[PDB]
Amino acid sequence: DEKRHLYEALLRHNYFPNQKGSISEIPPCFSSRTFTPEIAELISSDTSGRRSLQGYDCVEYYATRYNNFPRTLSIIHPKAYSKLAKHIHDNWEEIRFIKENENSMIKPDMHADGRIIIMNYEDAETKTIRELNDGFGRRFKVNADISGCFTNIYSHSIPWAVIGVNNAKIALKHWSDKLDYFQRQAKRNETHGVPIGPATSSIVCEIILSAVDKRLRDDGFLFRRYIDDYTCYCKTHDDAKEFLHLLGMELSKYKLSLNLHKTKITNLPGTLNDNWVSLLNVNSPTKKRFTDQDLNKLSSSEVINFLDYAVQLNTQVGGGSILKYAISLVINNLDEYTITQVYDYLLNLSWHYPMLIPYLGVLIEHVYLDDGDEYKNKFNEILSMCAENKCSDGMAWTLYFCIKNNIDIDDDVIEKIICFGDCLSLCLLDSSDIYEEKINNFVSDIIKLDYEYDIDRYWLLFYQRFFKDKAPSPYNDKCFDIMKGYGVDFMPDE
Amino acid sequence: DEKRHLYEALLRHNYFPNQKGSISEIPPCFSSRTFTPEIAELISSDTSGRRSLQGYDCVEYYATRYNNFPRTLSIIHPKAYSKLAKHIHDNWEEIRFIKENENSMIKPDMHADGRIIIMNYEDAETKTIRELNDGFGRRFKVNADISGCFTNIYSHSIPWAVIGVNNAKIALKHWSDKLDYFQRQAKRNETHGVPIGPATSSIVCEIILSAVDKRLRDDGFLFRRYIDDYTCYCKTHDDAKEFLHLLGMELSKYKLSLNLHKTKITNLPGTLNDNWVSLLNVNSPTKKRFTDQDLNKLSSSEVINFLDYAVQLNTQVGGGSILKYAISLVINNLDEYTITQVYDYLLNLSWHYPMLIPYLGVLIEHVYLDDGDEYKNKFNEILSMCAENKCSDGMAWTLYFCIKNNIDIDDDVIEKIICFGDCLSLCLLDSSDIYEEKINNFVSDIIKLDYEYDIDRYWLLFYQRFFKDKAPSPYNDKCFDIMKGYGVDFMPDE
DNA sequence: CCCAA
DNA sequence: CCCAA
Numbered sequence: 001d002e003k004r005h006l007y008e009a010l011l012r013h014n015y016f017p018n019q020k021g022s023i024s025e026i027p028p029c030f031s032s033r034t035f036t037p038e039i040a041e042l043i044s045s046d047t048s049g050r051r052s053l054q055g056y057d058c059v060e061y062y063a064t065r066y067n068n069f070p071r072t073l074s075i076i077h078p079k080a081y082s083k084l085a086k087h088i089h090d091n092w093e094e095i096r097f098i099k100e101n102e103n104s105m106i107k108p109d110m111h112a113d114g115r116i117i118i119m120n121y122e123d124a125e126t127k128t129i130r131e132l133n134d135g136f137g138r139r140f141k142v143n144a145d146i147s148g149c150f151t152n153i154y155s156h157s158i159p160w161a162v163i164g165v166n167n168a169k170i171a172l173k174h175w176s177d178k179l180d181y182f183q184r185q186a187k188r189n190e191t192h193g194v195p196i197g198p199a200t201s202s203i204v205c206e207i208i209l210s211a212v213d214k215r216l217r218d219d220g221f222l223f224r225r226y227i228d229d230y231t232c233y234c235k236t237h238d239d240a241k242e243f244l245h246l247l248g249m250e251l252s253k254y255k256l257s258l259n260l261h262k263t264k265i266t267n268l269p270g271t272l273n274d275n276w277v278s279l280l281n282v283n284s285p286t287k288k289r290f291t292d293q294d295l296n297k298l299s300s301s302e303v304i305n306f307l308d309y310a311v312q313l314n315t316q317v318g319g320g321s322i323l324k325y326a327i328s329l330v331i332n333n334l335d336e337y338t339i340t341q342v343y344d345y346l347l348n349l350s351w352h353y354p355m356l357i358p359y360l361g362v363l364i365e366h367v368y369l370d371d372g373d374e375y376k377n378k379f380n381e382i383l384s385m386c387a388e389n390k391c392s393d394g395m396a397w398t399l400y401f402c403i404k405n406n407i408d409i410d411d412d413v414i415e416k417i418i419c420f421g422d423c424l425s426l427c428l429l430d431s432s433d434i435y436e437e438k439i440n441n442f443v444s445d446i447i448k449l450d451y452e453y454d455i456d457r458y459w460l461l462f463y464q465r466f467f468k469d470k471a472p473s474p475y476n477d478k479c480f481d482i483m484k485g486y487g488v489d490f491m492p493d494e
Numbered sequence: 495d496e497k498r499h500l501y502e503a504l505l506r507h508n509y510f511p512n513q514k515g516s517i518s519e520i521p522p523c524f525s526s527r528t529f530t531p532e533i534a535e536l537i538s539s540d541t542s543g544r545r546s547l548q549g550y551d552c553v554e555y556y557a558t559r560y561n562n563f564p565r566t567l568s569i570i571h572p573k574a575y576s577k578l579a580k581h582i583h584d585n586w587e588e589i590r591f592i593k594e595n596e597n598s599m600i601k602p603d604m605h606a607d608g609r610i611i612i613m614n615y616e617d618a619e620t621k622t623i624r625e626l627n628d629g630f631g632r633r634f635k636v637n638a639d640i641s642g643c644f645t646n647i648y649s650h651s652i653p654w655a656v657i658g659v660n661n662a663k664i665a666l667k668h669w670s671d672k673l674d675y676f677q678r679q680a681k682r683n684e685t686h687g688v689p690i691g692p693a694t695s696s697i698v699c700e701i702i703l704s705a706v707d708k709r710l711r712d713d714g715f716l717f718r719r720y721i722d723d724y725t726c727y728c729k730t731h732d733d734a735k736e737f738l739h740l741l742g743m744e745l746s747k748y749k750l751s752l753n754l755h756k757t758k759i760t761n762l763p764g765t766l767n768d769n770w771v772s773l774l775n776v777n778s779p780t781k782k783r784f785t786d787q788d789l790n791k792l793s794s795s796e797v798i799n800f801l802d803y804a805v806q807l808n809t810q811v812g813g814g815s816i817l818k819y820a821i822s823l824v825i826n827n828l829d830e831y832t833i834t835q836v837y838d839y840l841l842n843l844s845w846h847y848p849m850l851i852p853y854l855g856v857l858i859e860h861v862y863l864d865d866g867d868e869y870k871n872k873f874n875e876i877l878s879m880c881a882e883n884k885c886s887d888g889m890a891w892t893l894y895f896c897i898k899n900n901i902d903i904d905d906d907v908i909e910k911i912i913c914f915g916d917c918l919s920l921c922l923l924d925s926s927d928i929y930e931e932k933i934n935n936f937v938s939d940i941i942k943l944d945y946e947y948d949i950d951r952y953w954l955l956f957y958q959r960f961f962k963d964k965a966p967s968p969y970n971d972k973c974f975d976i977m978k979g980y981g982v983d984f985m986p987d988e
Numbered sequence: 989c990c991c992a993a
Numbered sequence: 994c995c996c997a998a
């Protein structure tokens with residue numbers, strides 16, 4: 001069944017921010033499997049406990065973008081997420097009209113690993129064929145995106161996009177009103193915005209934006225969208241302006257607006273990908289496959305010169321993930337001679353850009369971690385700069401690399417981790433069990449603060465301490481006991 | 495008394511978005527005088543009526559910025575604004591700690607016209623002296639502003655900035671909790687964001703940001719702020735980075751974050767103003783005053799060439815209000831020979847940029863508006879462009895110019911105004927009284943929609959129709975009757 | 989003096 | 994094939 005696949009995707013595969021297909025933003029130690037639909041069905045049925053504050057807060061995660069910009073990802077509290085996932089699954093025969101959208105390329109799908117929503121899984125060549133077919137006969141292309149799409153979704157516009165704005169306002173129950181209420185309860189009983197990273201909020205965004213896709217399709221516009229990004233192919237510049245006007249109208253019906261910084265009109269024929277994609281791919285040492293494994297093992301000079309050229313291209317243009325794409329080009333084709341030099345280049349670059357920190361794990365097996373103690377200082381310096389820059393992706397990834405490889409962590413960097421106080425870093429330190437007393441003092445300060453939302457911001461840490469029998473449940477409800485009794489661990493071992 | 499000056503400023507001078515000192519965004523026909531303290535004290539006392547929806551919506555206004563970007567200004571519903579203004583004033587001895595801030599340049603003050611808050615009233619030479627004193631001995635400057643400051647203020651952070659975050663969370667009444675509640679009721683019972691344009695929300699932003707200013711001052715940072723823009727002067731680059739880190743920390747305590755697009759570090763000595771300010775002022779025809787009125791009357795060639803050079807500089811740089819500054823340089827020094835040519839240039843430019851539409855009224859008296867009917871087509875074409883571009887400042891300003899000068903308005907652009915459906919343009923058309931039936935159909939559709947927030951979005955139109963005895967009060971409360979009985983007109987004549 | 993924020 | 998969005 002496909003409805004069951006929705007349930008398993010919502011709980012076990014796309015509860016955490018696992019939407020990136022190439023490499024996960026969150027380290028693989030955190031996971032959402034062994035969170036079975038029966039367990040969420042039990043949590044939703046539970047009525048025990050009482051909360052003074054309406055709604056729930058979410059575990060916060062700050063991931064660096066390509067330009068070192070913070071992006072806010074959220075891990076929803078399992079009570080609110082369990083109710084939301086149950087309500088989404090129980091009415092998928094009313095919701096699955098977002099599956100049959102030809103203008104939304106990123107949408108729920110029945111993937112092999114189990115996830116419904118994977119960002120850029122269709123790859124650039126199937127994208128190339130479609131882009132070539134759409135671009136034919138048109139001499140203008142429009143790139144326009146919503147300004148704050150996930151962060152300013154009006155939750156009360158969830159019923160509207162289901163049944164029309166006017167009919168829903170006149171009717172002021174229906175399933176989409178309850179979906180509105182559950183999406184509000186997921187984030188502090190707040191109508192504006194949705195959490196970023198779970199697939200329930202991406203489902204909500206698909207539901208809202210599918211009405212705009214429908215009323216743009218009915219006017220005969222040939223357009224595609226990737227979440228919030230609309231690309232349009234117009235024979236005339238006038239039809240391009242008319243598309244921008246109609247998109248503004250239909251988004252303003254749902255309290256949404258265009259990002260006019262990124263909204264631009266270009267003259268076809270333009271590049272199908274970005275420019276630096278083609279510049280890196282013509283200069284790539286691995287752009288030709290020789291079908292024998294010895295011939296495509298790159299020497300040290302080729303990888304070093306390609307990485308230097310990629311650094312120059314990223315500095316000169318700065319309009320995309322030049323370094324991410326470049327190191328993902330040449331990291332699997334190395335031989336054992338240049339493994340250490342490339343690892344040193346990656347260490348320097350991953351200090352200078354935290355986004356390149358997850359790549360180290362693919363070369364961390366071949367590099368001898370002990371060596372002359374130098375790599376311990378490498379990882380501790382990276383941890384210190386991750387604490388200062390208040391980034392969560394690189395900091396948690398570096399904790400994962402230090403713990404998984406038995407690399408010691410200094411006390412001063414533990415103290416500035418404490419000062420940073422991001423939830424998943426503290427969950428990793430909790431999993432280390434060395435710093436149990438300092439984690440105990442931190443969660444004790446959270447407890448004596450007496451704020452429900454501050455406990456909800458670290459529910460993952462509190463539940464992980466409960467699962468190893470090191471802390472009582474801060475909540476008076478039985479959701480944590482239901483999760484523990486049925487075997488839910490968000491740091492599972494093999 | 496200064497408290498009484500606060501109350502008159504809140505109701506009669508800064509209820510509407512009147513913070514711009516050079517020229518108002520809103521046309522002079524809309525005004526907030528004859529809304530005295532006694533009427534607001536009566537409306538706050540009124541308990542009659544019932545509303546199904548908590549909170550109030552606000553009259554929406556979309557003003558184009560220098561780069562044609564829409565900025566959302568809001569006119570708060572007079573019940574919510576009257577309660578909010580009464581609560582702000584009744585505790586000004588607790589609130590006026592924002593007056594004694596030396597880092598907030600734009601703040602409440604006792605001005606001559608009566609407004610508490612005027613943006614850029616100090617002028618650039620008093621700013622020049624202070625900027626020169628601050629910039630001395632420092633070789634780096636930091637420009638960092640909050641990303642969505644007014645739109646993403648958390649209302650529940652209003653108690654925190656009064657009494658500390660931890661003390662307010664432990665206490666979870668105090669006056670700031672009620673100020674929280676009233677600021678929420680001003681905008682749809684929503685904790686996120688404040689309306690833009692009234693001085694109550696600017697007072698709220700001062701209250702929130704003054705704690706950040708205090709904890710930035712205590713570390714010895716020499717910095718200034720203009721609403722949300724922080725400028726800092728550092729002897730070293732590391733002091734600049736440390737200021738950025740501490741500012742990020744103290745804003746993140748209040749769920750606030752920097753705009754890292756506009757956050758940039760420059761090397762002193764940089765210019766006190768922008769670059770194009772200096773290029774326009776060295777090339778200005780009026781940069782020297784000859785103290786006799788005949789000698790500084792500019793000929794046609796000087797003004798035309800200065801405006802063309804300004805158009806070129808605005809096209810080439812595009813980093814500020816080049817055209818706004820340039821036309822405000824040379825518009826008062828014209829003689830009667832070049833008045834019509836400058837009006838034609840302003841008409842073309844004001845069609846191409848709506849922000850230059852308010853200037854036309856200073857040259858609309860000398861030019862014969864009848865002429866050979868051409869100016870009527872000018873204004874109607876500008877109106878159609880304003881309705882296409884969904885801007886409210888230029889559209890309402892052009893309505894003001896057409897109505898005030900007895901200029902006829904075509905029916906097709908009236909229908910396109912109704913299709914746009916901005917509130918203040920419809921208030922002006924209501925004031926014209928020619929289009930009473932179409933306005934009646936529009937507000938009748940709003941009434942049969944049966945939504946409280948859609949009536950609150952056009953409360954000004956509904957009250958203006960109620961004041962001329964052309965429509966009943968949509969609300970069951972007596973606030974409109976209190977305002978009508980005591981003589982409140984938001985379109986008053988002299 | 990004449991903008992913006 | 995190997996990014997982002």
Ligand SMILES: Nc1ccn([C@H]2C[C@H](O)[C@@H](COP(=O)(O)OP(=O)(O)OP(=O)(O)O)O2)c(=O)n1
Binds near residue numbers: 019146147227998
């Ligand atoms: N790991 C994930 C999971 C989900 N999303 C979602 C949230 C974003 O809203 C959407 C794509 O939108 P943008 O990245 O363009 O971001 P915004 O719309 O929030 O802002 P802006 O237009 O200012 O960049 O993808 C994401 O970015 N990253």
Ligand SMILES: Nc1ccn([C@H]2C[C@H](O)[C@@H](COP(=O)(O)OP(=O)(O)OP(=O)(O)O)O2)c(=O)n1
Binds near residue numbers: 639
């Ligand atoms: N006529 C008025 C009255 C008030 N404000 C307020 C609201 C704005 O939040 C604040 C200054 O902030 P910015 O103009 O820099 O705008 P934002 O902070 O909203 O956004 P961004 O940093 O993206 O420009 O001034 C304004 O801009 N214009």
Ligand SMILES: [Mn+2]
Binds near residue numbers: 145146149
């Ligand atoms: Mn966007």
Ligand SMILES: [Mn+2]
Binds near residue numbers: 227998
């Ligand atoms: Mn996008």
Ligand SMILES: [Mn+2]
Binds near residue numbers: 639
């Ligand atoms: Mn800002």
Ligand SMILES: [Mn+2]
Binds near residue numbers: 639640721723993
């Ligand atoms: Mn600003």
